[PDB]
Design a protein around this ligand. Structure first.
Ligand SMILES: Cc1cc2nc3c(=O)[nH]c(=O)nc-3n(C[C@H](O)[C@H](O)[C@H](O)COP(=O)(O)O)c2cc1C
Ligand SMILES: Cc1cc2nc3c(=O)[nH]c(=O)nc-3n(C[C@H](O)[C@H](O)[C@H](O)COP(=O)(O)O)c2cc1C
Ligand SMILES: Cc1cc2nc3c(=O)[nH]c(=O)nc-3n(C[C@H](O)[C@H](O)[C@H](O)COP(=O)(O)O)c2cc1C
Ligand SMILES: Cc1cc2nc3c(=O)[nH]c(=O)nc-3n(C[C@H](O)[C@H](O)[C@H](O)COP(=O)(O)O)c2cc1C
Lengths: 394, 394, 394, 394
């Protein structure tokens, strides 16, 4: 280890012997190249957000209106970016946010296994979506020794919800993330224009196809056996659609907590009283997010919500995503009080240009830049990166 | 002299006899032409900043949000733009900020000697970087009668730091600037993309190559004699890299002050309590700067910091750089309470289009415009240019 | 596979069930997307040609000035596009031309194996370069039952030449292609500008590092043994450079024919007298080419040479490459008398966007269009497609 | 220097140790960058041609319509590009054509000395214009051991003409070039638009101001003596204008040959009957040119004239310029029978980006490409490169 910023030294070292980089170095170049390297349906699905995309863009723009105050003569020559979350020490305050189509962002069709392997090699935890090409058991093996988390899309069948949760616990996941802001799909003009919706073609349904409860219920509905389902998952895509999206209730959350020992983390919280109610009810983690503006175009940047969610959450850890594009953004969200920050769009582009090694380069680039900003600007660890280190800017 | 604004009269005078200008007249045209006139590696290194460059750009944008209030019927027909700093009278409240690769911005490879000669001819002080092609002794001779300042990059070897400081004092430098915000290098995507890092190819290492301490220590490490080092400085580039960047401490600053009679000026201060602590400890000068946003992309414009640094510094002089592009910006930073303002990017472009005469044209153009704004808007000297002469603007 | 044109029916069939294509369908879109999907050094090497690239462009433009005359009421409802070459029946009159960096055009770094697998699945013969990441023995296995050809870069060392030739025969290759137009590298501004030359970094040298003659001669030269060479091929990159480019003579061709039973095919012939002298010498095939304009910018389109080379070659087969981009170009070169047509740039783009499946899509797209043109315009087989089916066009 | 093409090996060699090129490698990039690096008046003068510039463009376009036929198995592993002209052996069949404002294309204002030094280092002969900042005596010294030629602008004063001719002989020049197509200046919209005409400002008149005949005649005309003239050459700009342009006659050429031992070379010949009459007169060289289309926009490409001028000139050497941009063009003009080819616009750009080293890079780049084309395409020397090696192309 010594420090995440050391990553730039190998890049410069290789140039001295005539070995040029092969992947881009900034989000802008990641996005521009990766968008052209993808099939058109995958590009539409990944780049696209809800409505006219103002929220998706405003999430990113929010980071331009905070500045870190540099502190001189601090000699922050060794940084400690580790964080302890629900009993596990993370090597970095950053994680791969769940992406249901990441498998298709890689040319080999296994971008989800690629992400888990990148997590094994880097120490950056992976959160698998419920939607995936590799089963959650295989993903957890690919993540090696790195803490791994399971994101539940709570289905409209409690036996299936319990089966997923049980499977995640047995597979060794370190926590359960329940996504609250996508139980129906928002208006997404780019996908609508070409009527693009991959899961209805039977893609990324492996966690259902491999589930005993889903197999039995689909067989009762259709007569189709588990082997036929595995050979053509699209046979069950309409059945999947019928049970995909339960609208979760507070009572559901109480029931989930009572059937698992995993810590439960609620994803999509923006209002501080929702954070307050959740923490007062025993929820282990708050994950402040608006799903990258992909599911509703209501206009409120996710970052605008983070300080009051942090206040309301007290000592309950708060995760943050929606709008992170560079290591500067990582540092700003951490200074606002997020315990760790999730990466979405950037690592989908990584997958498109280089599979597992591309994802890793994205993660190492983001952490290198965050660590170097902390070094230069005089913040030696995350405990010292407090909210009074920021200033609002024009 | 009479006044810096007189420079425009020779430009218009020459047009009357059919002699057109040969160099550009505005920063935009300096930048656009100079960028094309440079080798690609030098362009990447000079234009590039840290991360997505938001800080580098916000430094410049800050100046658009202050307006000088014009005062009529003041008859400011003679301006006094002189300033007295640590016992020396500067003819202008402006200086060339240190640029470690300025030598390579000129086609002849001696852009640093060119800058010093431009300083000799104009009265605009030159601050030599520690990184340079001409030794600090030669630079000081080229600066003629103009006050000249030495910028130290404090190395990870106290014998070498003392050798540099001693050499600067003996050579007749008027002050020592210690840069605090670049002891490790920030994430710089343009340079990373092409793995561009000139000093590791042995460029601009002349102050080390000519130093007795560095020669002896490198010879102990490598067996290489001082003549071989001079003939191929790249032999020592890895050794240079190993000692380049000491992370300076408050105690280091106390030690530096005790071994030199030069005034000591701290470069990179942004936080007012860092200014306060420095002034209370006997530091002679505060140099408010964020290194043009080149080393950390934390988002806080340098100008946003200047008023509170000025308040905290009391009667200790405050220098300012990061974002100055025209004479209007010079006047605004001076009205905020900087004693003098440093020029970076603009004079690198000057060097690229015209060597020493290009650098001089940049300096004379900036001062002409500042002096004419003061004349027209009714401010006859710098004492009258106070912070209440500005207004915030949209 | 009744006819190559049937490939379009699967594409349309799938859209009727809501499955959109994922790869582009025209050369212009292959090129546009693939160029963005590649690392910058591979893009420069693959897209770039010699000089100002007029020859590379003129090769392509030449196909715009020949038009096929449509014949109605011919009921070409079954097409025979097969060709018998040196005793083997090709299912298509088309092959993958040798590309020494094809390995690096795919993200997994094994685009050469990927090409051989696409050849195994399509029946379109692959010609491996002497430069490769997989050994020629491994490539031949990957090509399955499809005829495969070995392209020799004749080295400045006859023992090594004989080893390569013997290995290819033993490995089961069906012919030996000797490239006559790259024993020295032509002026290539795009590569020169970034000083990009992959082989000197020890890339794609596997056929040398696995060769017993090369191992012994390099071990004699440097001291390093076979394992140190397999572990760091760059140790031998300078040695490779010294022997890579023997300027072949007529006497060498005589000698080559005497040590192999394989048919010998000369690549790079443009002048009819060269083709006539080769055939009189008992050379088995003439491969009309100008290396895509990548080695010399002399300005003569390859297609302009093809009719006279065909005429001078008598009953000896003529292969043709340099400027093929679509299936229309394939039909025009066959009509001028090529027995089979080589594909270069287009399948590099295929590798970049889809590995082996992308290469396969390029090949099946070209053949589908050529087959459909023949069907619609009334040419039932390659015998009926002759130079008098063509007209010059403005 | 075994062959000119070896220049590419240094460029690639340096990239292997992380040293990137600093100058462009193609004419398109030389032109693009140099045009931005120049003062606007020099750009207008250098880039601009006569009228709507169709002739200047058509000169260049003509090279796109000739293609060199590649010859295989010629083993041209050693090339002889030397040429013997009027008793001197040139190492290259290429020279720097006269450029009367070349001094001002370099930033230091001495681009003419810089060209002569590049000639001294490369062996590519320099032809100095009568218009220059360095005296013809100083230029000849700067050219070292390389043959040098003096281009006469024959003045309306035979005493002055005789002085110039005598000075060039005494100074050691190897030939006298008489330019026949600029005794009056053609319509040049780019210069007219900004009324740009440098010589009338007293620029580049050193050969007149240092001439004893000019000094006496001007002193008689105006009253000012030699020192007042050396100190302000613009005093004599109107007088220079009055005598600059004598329209040369056949009788003048007879007279010139009688007063010098130097070979006499006529520049601007396009019509075969003019070449035939000159050779019959005992003129030593024919210099086929249309002044780059800079003086008259009549629309005939210079290259279109070259074959018939060669044929009419018998065994008298023919030089050629007007439209050469790359080494491919150099090969094509030599193949049509030019004994040597002149370079204009390209080395002005070289001066603008790099002074003498930039000029040298342009020259070595052109020759490297020409040499490599000859090697790859099978032409061992200039004798083997004849007009039947070429084909017309669309
Ligand atoms: C293509 C794509 C698919 C996604 N699928 C999921 C998912 O399956 N489950 C989930 O909780 N969030 C999903 N998200 C939301 C991400 O977890 C995260 O909240 C979001 O990407 C952050 O916004 P940003 O990418 O704009 O920074 C997805 C995001 C993207 C880009
Ligand atoms: C190419 C370049 C190199 C620099 N090298 C140095 C240096 O050697 N030492 C130093 O203290 N600052 C260095 N700086 C920072 C400048 O002193 C100054 O703070 C900065 O240029 C102001 O930002 P601006 O150019 O955006 O206005 C350099 C600046 C540039 C543009
Ligand atoms: C990137 C690249 C590398 C090449 N490598 C080789 C090689 O190793 N051996 C060879 O005989 N020809 C080589 N060629 C030339 C090709 O076999 C073929 O002649 C050329 O690609 C045809 O021109 P086109 O691609 O413009 O249609 C290469 C071509 C490309 C694009
Ligand atoms: C800026 C410039 C000035 C010129 N000056 C002269 C000159 O003093 N004497 C002369 O004989 N030709 C002169 N020429 C013509 C050149 O010698 C040569 O014929 C022309 O540049 C060739 O055309 P090209 O540059 O378009 O290839 C000049 C050319 C240029 C570009």
């Amino acid at each position: 280890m010594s420090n995440w910023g050391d990553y730039e030294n190998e890049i410069y070292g290789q140039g001295l012997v005539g070995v040029a980089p092969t992947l881009p170095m900034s989000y802008a170049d990641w996005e521009a190249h990766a968008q052209q390297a993808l099939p058109p349906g995958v590009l539409s699905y990944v780049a696209g957000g809800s409505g006219d995309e103002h929220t998706q863009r405003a999430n990113v723009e929010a980071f331009k209106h905070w500045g870190l105050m540099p502190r001189m003569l601090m000699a922050a020559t060794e940084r400690d970016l580790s964080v302890e979350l629900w009993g596990k020490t993370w090597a970095a305050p950053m994680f791969f946010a769940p992406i249901g189509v990441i498998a298709l962002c890689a040319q080999d069709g296994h971008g989800d296994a690629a992400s888990a392997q990148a997590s094994a090699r880097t120490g950056v935890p992976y959160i698998t979506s419920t939607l995936a090409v590799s089963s959650l058991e295989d993903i957890r093996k690919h993540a090696g020794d790195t803490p791994a988390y399971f994101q539940l899309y709570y289905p409209e069948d409690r036996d299936l919800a319990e089966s997923f949760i049980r499977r995640a616990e047995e597979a060794g996941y370190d926590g359960l993330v329940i996504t609250l802001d996508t139980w129906i799909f928002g208006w997404r003009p780019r996908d609508l224009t070409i009527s693009n919706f991959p899961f209805l073609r039977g893609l990324a349904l492996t966690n259902y196809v491999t589930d005993p409860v889903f197999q039995k219920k689909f067989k009762a509905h259709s007569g189709v056996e588990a082997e036929g389902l595995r050979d053509n998952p699209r046979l069950a895509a309409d059945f999947w659609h019928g049970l995909f999206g339960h609208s979760v209730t507070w009572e559901d959350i109480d029931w989930v907590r009572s059937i698992t020992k995993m810590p439960v983390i609620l994803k999509g919280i923006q209002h501080p009283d929702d954070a307050r109610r959740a923490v007062d009810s025993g929820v282990d983690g708050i994950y402040c997010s608006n799903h990258g503006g992909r599911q509703a175009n209501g206009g409120l940047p996710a970052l605008d919500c983070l300080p009051e969610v942090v206040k309301a959450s007290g000592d309950t850890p708060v995760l943050f995503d929606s709008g992170i594009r560079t290591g500067a953004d990582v540092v700003k969200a951490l200074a606002m009080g997020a315990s760790a920050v999730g990466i979405g769009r950037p690592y989908a582009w990584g997958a498109a240009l280089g599979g597992s090694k591309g994802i890793e380069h994205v993660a190492r680039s983001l952490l290198a830049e965050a660590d170097l900003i902390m070094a230069v600007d005089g913040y030696r660890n995350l405990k010292e990166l407090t909210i009074d280190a920021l200033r609002p800017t024009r």
